Structure formats: structure tokens, C-alpha cells
Amino acid sequence: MCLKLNLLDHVFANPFMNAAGVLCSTEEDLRCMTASSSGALVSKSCTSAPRDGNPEPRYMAFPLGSINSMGLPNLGFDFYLKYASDLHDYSKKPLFLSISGLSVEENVAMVRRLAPVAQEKGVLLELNLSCPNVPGKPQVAYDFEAMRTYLQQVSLAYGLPFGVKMPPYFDIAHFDTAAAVLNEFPLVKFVTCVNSVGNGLVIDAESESVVIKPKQGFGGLGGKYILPTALANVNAFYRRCPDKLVFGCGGVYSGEDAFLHILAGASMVQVGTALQEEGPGIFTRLEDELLEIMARKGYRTLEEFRGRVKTIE
Amino acid sequence: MCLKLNLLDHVFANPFMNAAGVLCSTEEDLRCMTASSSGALVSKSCTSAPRDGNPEPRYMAFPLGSINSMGLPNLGFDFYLKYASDLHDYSKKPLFLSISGLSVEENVAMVRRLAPVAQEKGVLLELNLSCPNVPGKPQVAYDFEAMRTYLQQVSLAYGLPFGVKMPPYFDIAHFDTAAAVLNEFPLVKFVTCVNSVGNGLVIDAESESVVIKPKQGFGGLGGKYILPTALANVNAFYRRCPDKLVFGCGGVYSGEDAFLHILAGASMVQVGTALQEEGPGIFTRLEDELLEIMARKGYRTLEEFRGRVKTIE
Numbered sequence: 157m158c159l160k161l162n163l164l165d166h167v168f169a170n171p172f173m174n175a176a177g178v179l180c181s182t183e184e185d186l187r188c189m190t191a192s193s194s195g196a197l198v199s200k201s202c203t204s205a206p207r208d209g210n211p212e213p214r215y216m217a218f219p220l221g222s223i224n225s226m227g228l229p230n231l232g233f234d235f236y237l238k239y240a241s242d243l244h245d246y247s248k249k250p251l252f253l254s255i256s257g258l259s260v261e262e263n264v265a266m267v268r269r270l271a272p273v274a275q276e277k278g279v280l281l282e283l284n285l286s287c288p289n290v291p292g293k294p295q296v297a298y299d300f301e302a303m304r305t306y307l308q309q310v311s312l313a314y315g316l317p318f319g320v321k322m323p324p325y326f327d328i329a330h331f332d333t334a335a336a337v338l339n340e341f342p343l344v345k346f347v348t349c350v351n352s353v354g355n356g357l358v359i360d361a362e363s364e365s366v367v368i369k370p371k372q373g374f375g376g377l378g379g380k381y382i383l384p385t386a387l388a389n390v391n392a393f394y395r396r397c398p399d400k401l402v403f404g405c406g407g408v409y410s411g412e413d414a415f416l417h418i419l420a421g422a423s424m425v426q427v428g429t430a431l432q433e434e435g436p437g438i439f440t441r442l443e444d445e446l447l448e449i450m451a452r453k454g455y456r457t458l459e460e461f462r463g464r465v466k467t468i469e
Numbered sequence: 470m471c472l473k474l475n476l477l478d479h480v481f482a483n484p485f486m487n488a489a490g491v492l493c494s495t496e497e498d499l500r501c502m503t504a505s506s507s508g509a510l511v512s513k514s515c516t517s518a519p520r521d522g523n524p525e526p527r528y529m530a531f532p533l534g535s536i537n538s539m540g541l542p543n544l545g546f547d548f549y550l551k552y553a554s555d556l557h558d559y560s561k562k563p564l565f566l567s568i569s570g571l572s573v574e575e576n577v578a579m580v581r582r583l584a585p586v587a588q589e590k591g592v593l594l595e596l597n598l599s600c601p602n603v604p605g606k607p608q609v610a611y612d613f614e615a616m617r618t619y620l621q622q623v624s625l626a627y628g629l630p631f632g633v634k635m636p637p638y639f640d641i642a643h644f645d646t647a648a649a650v651l652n653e654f655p656l657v658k659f660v661t662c663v664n665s666v667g668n669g670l671v672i673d674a675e676s677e678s679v680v681i682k683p684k685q686g687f688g689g690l691g692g693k694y695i696l697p698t699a700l701a702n703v704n705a706f707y708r709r710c711p712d713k714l715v716f717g718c719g720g721v722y723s724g725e726d727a728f729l730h731i732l733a734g735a736s737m738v739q740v741g742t743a744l745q746e747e748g749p750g751i752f753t754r755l756e757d758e759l760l761e762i763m764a765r766k767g768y769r770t771l772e773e774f775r776g777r778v779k780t781i782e
């Protein structure tokens with residue numbers, strides 16, 4: 157009995173990793189994730205120049221999940237590149253690097269410099285097409301024409317295997333369109349579903365007040381609120397992109413949620429809000445929980461049930 | 470202290486009502502919601518001809534909410550018109566009628582006949598632009614050009630005050646465009662935010678199966694999953710539509726959840742999943758809870774806190 161996977165020319169002790177943004181902005185965070193039992197890690201989505209992000213409070217967690225409008229704080233692309241180049245221990249686990257520039261030109265500039273490090277070190281790119289929290293910057297992947305441009309330019313400039321972080325959709329025609337756009341780009345080897353559910357609004361009853369400061373309280377939701385949305389996008393893209401990998405993200409607190417993700421078609425499973433709240437010790441729990449589920453069901457590997465959700469009639 | 474209010478030339482005893490689709494398909498259903506202590510009711514969304522809807526199972530509920538792909542089963546516009554014209558007791562509470570024709574022409578044909586009944590009886594139209602559940606018929610209001618077309622045509626054909634049932638949005642530009650489309654139409658007096666969050670997917674871990682039969686298990690989500698999404702939509706349209714009423718729907722289980730909808734901007738508060746699970750007794754509980762919250766806070770009217778959610782700085 158076995159959680160191991162071999163994908164994108166990398167070996168992974170298990171399918172669990174952090175979700176981009178959680179426990180991965182600093183060298184400290186990145187060392188902690190590397191020392192965890194996770195099968196991999198992804199760095200904070202980054203821009204060319206360092207960013208402070210939005211004013212605090214900008215994240216808040218609740219029994220049923222979280223809301224955030226961080227505003228893309230990060231240490232700058234130079235820092236995450238150098239981390240991949242010179243600091244990361246690839247003998248421990250694979251590293252993904254998330255880039256989330258604010259224009260196609262910014263992203264082009266970044267991937268041109270990442271390319272030789274990817275070739276040398278085998279760092280994998282996750283291209284963020286779904287930040288919902290910087291104003292006047294509505295999410296790329298909700299504009300299919302813009303999405304096409306980003307993927308053309310980045311394929312051209314990068315010329316290596318990468319993946320894309322997608323926002324959730326809520327409409328069959330949008331699964332259709334979005335999956336066909338992706339399938340135009342053979343360098344897109346994986347699709348991460350999903351980023352937070354955009355622009356929800358949490359309100360505290362006692363104080364009569366929104367709980368995060370930026371954007372009049374509006375920010376992205378994660379956690380228990382979004383699991384069924386996440387499972388839908390995962391499976392929508394799994395069925396729609398049979399020559400790609402789907403990484404699942406959204407609402408994972410247990411081996412069971414991870415089990416459902418994987419049934420829906422997920423290869424890697426990312427953990428955001430639950431990791432933010434419980435800390436990196438979550439990865440040992442999730443492993444043991446998933447393994448107990450597999451044992452009880454007689455599954456010996458992940459590939460035995462990946463993508464095998466049953467439909468009725 | 471009493472929560473009575475006046476809107477759309479009608480008096481209401483309290484701001485509560487059922488969500489369209491819940492406890493309102495048959496005469497029996499409608500008499501039951503009429504005899505409840507709700508302040509109003511809305512009828513099941515209808516088409517010109519009777520429909521059986523999708524195959525069962527097509528609704529499932531869970532501690533955190535519901536998923537459905539009912540598929541618009543209804544008794545036919547002729548039945549709900551007759552209920553409106555001859556059977557409803559207007560002395561009890563006002564009545565909203567929901568129409569969900571599958572093309573502009575079908576809607577135009579329905580509202581042409583509703584018009585005289587609305588003149589005579591004051592029944593109120595709720596135009597449904599957001600069924601996420603009929604195959605091949607994606608949500609109207611996620612296509613702004615289609616939405617404009619429906620609102621032009623129904624406005625011309627009906628020539629009387631009506632409201633709209635909107636699907637949730639998740640991006641500021643969409644809020645901007647959607648509210649500006651609405652604002653093009655003076656006859657749109659109210660906006661109901663929100664319909665179910667479209668095309669979620671619920672999976673049963675033990676059985677490894679989706680839980681509803683239509684659309685490979687994909688359906689609309691209601692309940693605790695969507696409260697923050699609903700609040701965001703209510704507030705977004707409340708700020709962007711200063712000259713319309715906003716009706717809140719999504720994730721109401723208690724007087725607190727109603728207080729927050731009203732704080733976000735809600736004039737009426739609709740109840741779907743929680744009413745489906747608890748039954749019409751819920752209406753008396755919700756009233757007592759909301760009145761208890763008002764008293765502890767020193768509020769005497771709804772109008773004192775409606776839309777007065779506070780932001781930080």
C-alpha cells in the first residue's frame with residue numbers, strides 16, 4: 157500500500173502539497189514546507205518586483221473556511237528564482253514555482269529567466285491565471301481571449317512543460333470553452349483546479365462589519381465552503397482534458413476530501429486553508445487518513461481509483 | 470415591535486419568503502406557504518407547457534447545504550397564472566410569480582398574458598435569468614448581450630414593474646457590467662441575489678458515486694456553502710443599483726443570517742435549502758430570532774440597518 161506517484165518526469169512520495177500562497181512566501185516558509193511530509197511544494201505567486209500587498213486585516217478563517225484579499229504580497233521573482241536555483245533541495249521533494257504577473261509582458265519577462273533554471277534544476281512552473289484580489293485586474297481566465305494570449309506568449313517565450321492555476325467556473329459552456337483553450341496548448345501539462353471562489357463577503361454579526369479591510373470586505377473564499385465547487389472543476393477538466401494532468405485544490409481538510417478529489421480525477425492534491433489553520437503537521441494526518449481509506453477499500457495504489465467517480469445510470 | 474414593511478406598492482408583515490422552487494410547485498404547496506407566517510411567497514419557476522423535469526434522484530441535502538438539478542419541473546404557466554388570478558388569497562400576503570422560459574420568445578409569450586392579471590391582482594413577476602440546470606441552456610445572465618435582449622423584450626411586452634433572479638457573480642467587472650445592464654431598465658424594480666451556485670459536484674465517499682443522477686452529478690448548490698457568496702452579491706448590487714430594491718437569497722438558516730443579508734442591503738430575504746429541510750415552521754423561528762437580534766441591538770426598524778454594513782477605513 158502506496159501513495160507514491162511518478163509524474164511530469166518527477167517522483168513524489170505522496171500527492172499532497174501546499175496550495176500556492178500558503179506557507180511559501182519566505183525562505184523560512186519554504187524550508188518548513190520542505191521539511192514537512194508533503195510530496196511537494198509550490199512557492200508564493202510572485203511578481204517581477206517585490207510587493208507589500210494589501211492592508212491588514214487581509215485574511216480571516218472560520219469554521220467553514222477562509223476569505224482573503226492578500227493582494228499578491230511576495231518577495232519578488234528574483235527571490236523565488238534564486239530559491240529554485242541555489243537554495244532548494246530537490247533530493248527532498250519537487251518544487252513548483254508560481255508566477256502571477258499583472259500583464260502578459262510581465263509574465264513573459266519572468267518565464268524567459270525561469271527557463272534555464274527549469275532546464276537545469278527541473279523546477280516546474282505554475283502560471284497563475286486567477287488572482288481575484290488586485291483591483292481593476294479582473295481574472296485573466298474569466299476572459300477567454302486574454303487567456304489565449306497569455307498561453308501563446310508564455311508557451312512561445314518559455315517553450316517548456318508548465319501548468320496553469322485556474323479559477324472556478326460555474327457554467328457548462330465555460331467549462332467547454334476554457335477546456336478547449338487549454339487543449340490548444342500542448343505545453344500545458346497540468347491544470348490546477350481551483351483558485352479561491354472570487355469576491356465573497358463575510359460579515360460579522362456582532363460588530364456589523366466586514367472582516368477584511370481591502371476592497372470593502374470582498375475577497376476569495378476557500379475551505380469547506382468550496383469543496384463541491386472544487387470537485388466539479390477538477391472533474392470537468394479531467395473529462396475535458398484527457399491528455400493533461402489535473403491537480404486538485406479546494407476544501408481539503410482530510411484524507412476523505414483528498415479521496416474525493418482523486419476520484420474526481422486529481423493527481424496532486426493541494427491544501428490551502430486547512431494548512432494555514434492547522435500547520436504543516438496536517439500532511440502526516442492526511443496521508444494516514446487516505447491510506448486508511450484505501451486499506452478499508454482494498455485499493456493499493458492511487459491509479460486504481462483516480463478518475464473513477466461513478467455516475468448514476 | 471413588529472417587522473412589517475412596504476415595497477413595490479404592497480405591504481408585507483415581515484421580510485421573509487420562500488426561495489423560488491421550494492415548497493411552491495403545486496396548489497397544495499402554495500396553500501401551505503400561504504398559511505405559513507411568511508411575509509410573501511413565490512411560485513415555482515414555470516414554462517409555457519408542463520415539464521416533468523430531470524430524472525431522480527435530483528435533489529440531495531447535507532449538513533452544509535444542498536445540490537440540485539431539478540430541471541425546471543413545473544405545472545405549466547397556465548396553472549400558476551390561474552393560481553394567481555383565481556385562487557390566491559391576496560388578503561393574506563403578496564404573491565410573486567417566477568417565469569423561466571427557455572428563450573426570449575417563450576418569456577415574452579408568458580408575460581403578455583401575466584400583464585392583465587398583474588394589473589388586476591398585483592401579482593409580481595420575478596424573471597428567472599439564472600437556471601444553471603437545463604442541458605444546452607446555460608445561465609442567461611452570464612451572457613450580458615442575451616440578458617440585455619431578454620430585458621428589452623420583456624420590458625416592451627410587459628410594460629409593468631418586475632424583478633430579476635440573478636445568478637451569483639465572482640468578479641468585480643461582472644458586477645459592474647451586470648448592474649449597468651440592469652440599470653438600463655427602469656421597469657426592473659427588484660433584483661434577487663442569488664440563484665444557486667452553479668454546477669457543483671457532490672461525491673459520496675463510501676459509494677464512490679455522485680449523488681444526483683442528471684448531468685453526471687453536476688447541480689446547483691444552496692445552503693451554508695453559499696452564504697458568503699450571496700452576501701457579496703446582495704451587497705454588490707445594493708451599492709451598484711441605488712434606485713432598485715435587492716432581495717437576498719442564499720444560505721439563510723437563522724435570524725442572524727437574515728440580519729446579515731439585510732445589513733448587506735436586502736429588502737426581502739428568501740429561504741430555500743433551510744425551508745426545504747425544516748419545513749414552513751422555519752418562518753416563525755426566523756422572525757423570533759431576527760426580532761431578538763434587533764432588540765438586543767436597539768433597532769426598531771429594518772430601515773435602520775438595511776445596507777449599513779460597515780467597512781474598515
Ligand SMILES: Cc1cc2nc3c(=O)[nH]c(=O)nc-3n(C[C@H](O)[C@H](O)[C@H](O)COP(=O)(O)O)c2cc1C
Nearest residue numbers: 175176177201350351352378379406407427428429
Ligand atoms: C492566504 C491565501 C493566499 C493565497 N495565495 C495564493 C497565491 O499566491 N497564488 C495562488 O494561485 N493561489 C493562492 N491562494 C488560493 C489557494 O492557492 C487555493 O487556490 C484556495 O485557497 C482554495 O483552496 P483551499 O480551499 O484549500 O483554501 C491563496 C489562498 C489563501 C487563503
Ligand SMILES: Cc1cc2nc3c(=O)[nH]c(=O)nc-3n(C[C@H](O)[C@H](O)[C@H](O)COP(=O)(O)O)c2cc1C
Nearest residue numbers: 488489490514663664665691692719720740741742
Ligand atoms: C429544489 C430547489 C428548487 C429550486 N427551484 C428554483 C426555481 O424554480 N427558480 C429559481 O429561480 N430558483 C430555484 N432554486 C434556487 C433557490 O431559489 C435559491 O435561489 C437557492 O437555493 C439559494 O438559496 P438557499 O441557499 O436558501 O438554498 C431552487 C433551489 C432548490 C434547492
Ligand SMILES: O=C(O)c1[nH]c(=O)[nH]c(=O)c1I
Nearest residue numbers: 201226227228287289352376
Ligand atoms: O491575494 C493573493 O495573494 C491571492 N489570493 C488568492 O486567493 N488567490 C491568488 O491567486 C492570490 I495572487
Ligand SMILES: O=C(O)c1[nH]c(=O)[nH]c(=O)c1I
Nearest residue numbers: 514539540541600602665689
Ligand atoms: O432545476 C431547477 O428547477 C432549478 N434549480 C435551481 O437551483 N435554480 C433554478 O433556477 C431552477 I429553474
